[PDB]
Design a protein around this ligand. Structure first.
Ligand SMILES: Nc1ncnc2c1ncn2[C@@H]1O[C@H](COP(=O)(O)OP(=O)(O)O)[C@@H](O)[C@H]1O
Ligand SMILES: Nc1ncnc2c1ncn2[C@@H]1O[C@H](COP(=O)(O)OP(=O)(O)O)[C@@H](O)[C@H]1O
Ligand SMILES: [Mg+2]
Ligand SMILES: [Mg+2]
Lengths: 354, 364
């Protein structure tokens, strides 16, 4: 029962540090940048995850700066942050104290994959809708996650709540400012990224999201490949060869234009026969070559595929009610306010003033 | 646009007869008949089959790829001019009509090789063992020879990885294969940076350079060497940033100048300032120091700073291969290692004074 007490700064609000004690510290993962532990807050008994990262003393942490301003039900909450020293030297570590979430879309999907079972579409709708809400939210601040993948989507299976995590690659994208094309994990990288564009936009997160949806529907990654060339061949097999304008839309630079002219593969033949047409339709509107042609996250949320979620009688397979799905804020709807008419159904958020 | 002729020699045995063009010799079509066709590979481009030559009984591999009636096949054009003991041989090629449509398939008939560095390394990895260093020396040396050869023609493979390195276990012969990404690099001409497999990509490729040279193959070979010594890939990562982190952990943070060397264009300069990781601390204890020295000279940020394939061949890590009494563990003789040609040595002729050991120069 070794207790650790630190003076940590609330993730949000005023920089007014408080003493915080925790115990039952057990490693629960690793990262190229640092370790992630689980601990229990002594005062509340609540479980949290502590992401420890080496911090450059001379510069401020971008991940921390971004986390501090986010407050959405579908994004993992930064509870506190504090600094600790790495005895290995005069090394200083930034410790992010986050809400603890038990699962990830990756592990859950792997379970169904192994059991040779399909993840019920009700969950595909629930998880994807919540991911789009988190993207609509961060994108409204000009922030692009840049690493959307199953492992960065935390899940609480009992409540069916999804929380986007890992803002280690996130960045506010400013029109005209170049950005590195080597972010984002293989399989989920937008074509413009594979083509080396540095003028990409937040729509790269929408392509990534589309790859997650298709993978949840298919039971395996939709555009695998060990090399950029292999990945592009898989994309072309499904979408057909990119037009000259489309290539120009992604990145008007890359030389090699030598690519087998394949006709677009009917999106319907891509998935199993039982697959809902709305799911396929949504897919084709996310996985588009021309970045600007892709649906925005908010538009995705309003898509027909998510209509069941807006049904007043919908319930979770475990009998519980669905989690929060309609508590949209002005900020979240800013990219297209009129969508509120679709996004907040008649029965939702009905509350009188006594 | 050609055709085949299927029949049944005897016992119901299906025999396919085609008219193929010699891979290297003059265009004298020859009739080729084979049986027992079974898939032994598959790529986004086509399928690789194993077939038995009807008369010689010889086994061969047939790489079937969809052919674009638009331009000529670059892989075939390159393979046709190659002739080296450490490069898989193109016996002949022929076209076959894909019964699927007006689609034509190019068929490359290659010498068949039983293993790949990928499979062998995985066998040892599973058993939590490591490949004896003598094999690491033999395989890497042969890989560098094949690279010195194609590079002498200005050709860059662009996809060096364990799966593209065929091996004959008994003879310990290694043959480079898969020239589907290969291209002659002409200074001043831009080239795509999305070639090469993750884990084996040079940093300038990760940074998106389009003015890279053949030295990217040298970086890739360095990753193979390090991997054969470690038992696992040295620079894994699901994203480019993760890969760069692993690289920086070992090589240290790249100086602003080194960055300029790989790609003078990419933005992000925001990367943890880690100190150079003692290469000796990277490998298991008792790893030959020469092996570690070679790795460090192959895996350099600055492209022009990496050893060339011929220089790698002359490295001291391979001194044992030049010993007159060196033999394979199975008591057998090592494969041909010193029959260098003028072409092969063209990059630095004087290196031959090291590459060709005294005993190999004995008249007899
Ligand atoms: N709040 C959390 N609750 C539970 N597990 C977490 C939490 N945050 C992270 N993890 C686990 O740790 C892994 C690494 O965390 P992450 O934030 O993605 O760091 P990295 O930069 O290495 O990707 C995650 O993919 C996840 O499995
Ligand atoms: N000559 C050969 N002998 C035996 N197996 C081969 C031969 N050429 C290729 N293969 C097998 O087929 C796989 C794919 O061949 P490759 O030429 O690399 O095609 P691609 O990478 O374009 O799919 C190889 O990694 C190897 O295992
Ligand atoms: Mg992660
Ligand atoms: Mg290959």
């Amino acid at each position: 029962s070794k207790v650790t007490t630190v003076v940590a700064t609330p993730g949000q609000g005023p920089d007014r540090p408080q003493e915080v004690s925790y115990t039952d510290t057990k490693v629960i993962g690793n990262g190229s940048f640092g370790v992630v532990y689980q601990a229990k807050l002594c005062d509340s008994g609540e479980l949290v995850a502590i992401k420890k990262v080496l911090q450059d003393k001379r510069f401020k942490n971008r991940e921390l700066q971004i986390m501090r301003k986010l407050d959405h039900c579908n994004i993992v909450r930064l509870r506190y942050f504090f600094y600790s020293s790495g005895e290995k030297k005069d090394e200083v570590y930034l410790n992010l104290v986050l809400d603890y979430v038990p699962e990830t879309v990756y592990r859950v999907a792997r379970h169904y994959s192994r059991a040779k079972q399909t993840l019920p579409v009700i969950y595909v709708k629930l998880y994807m809708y919540q991911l789009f809400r988190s993207l609509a939210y961060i994108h409204s601040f000009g922030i692009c996650h840049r690493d959307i993948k199953p492992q960065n989507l935390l899940l609480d299976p009992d409540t069916a709540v999804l929380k986007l995590c890992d803002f280690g690659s996130a960045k506010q994208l400013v029109r005209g400012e170049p950005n590195v094309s080597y972010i984002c994990s293989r399989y989920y990288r937008a074509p413009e990224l594979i083509f080396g564009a540095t003028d990409y936009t937040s729509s790269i997160d929408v392509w990534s999201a589309g790859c997650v949806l298709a993978e949840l529907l298919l039971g395996q990654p939709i555009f695998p490949g060990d090399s950029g060339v292999d990945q592009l061949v898989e994309i072309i097999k499904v979408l057909g060869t990119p037009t000259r304008e489309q290539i120009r839309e992604m990145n008007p630079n890359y030389t090699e234009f030598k690519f087998p002219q394949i006709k677009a593969h009917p999106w319907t033949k891509v998935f199993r026969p039982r697959t809902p047409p709305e799911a396929i339709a949504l897919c084709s509107r996310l996985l588009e070559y021309t970045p600007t042609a892709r649906l925005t996250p908010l538009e995705a949320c309003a898509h027909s595929f998510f209509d069941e979620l807006r049904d007043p009688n919908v319930k979770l397979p475990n009998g519980r009610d669905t989690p929060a799905l309609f508590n949209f804020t002005t900020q979240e709807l800013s990219s297209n306010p009129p969508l509120a008419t679709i996004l907040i159904p008649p029965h939702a958020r009905i509350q009188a003033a006594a």
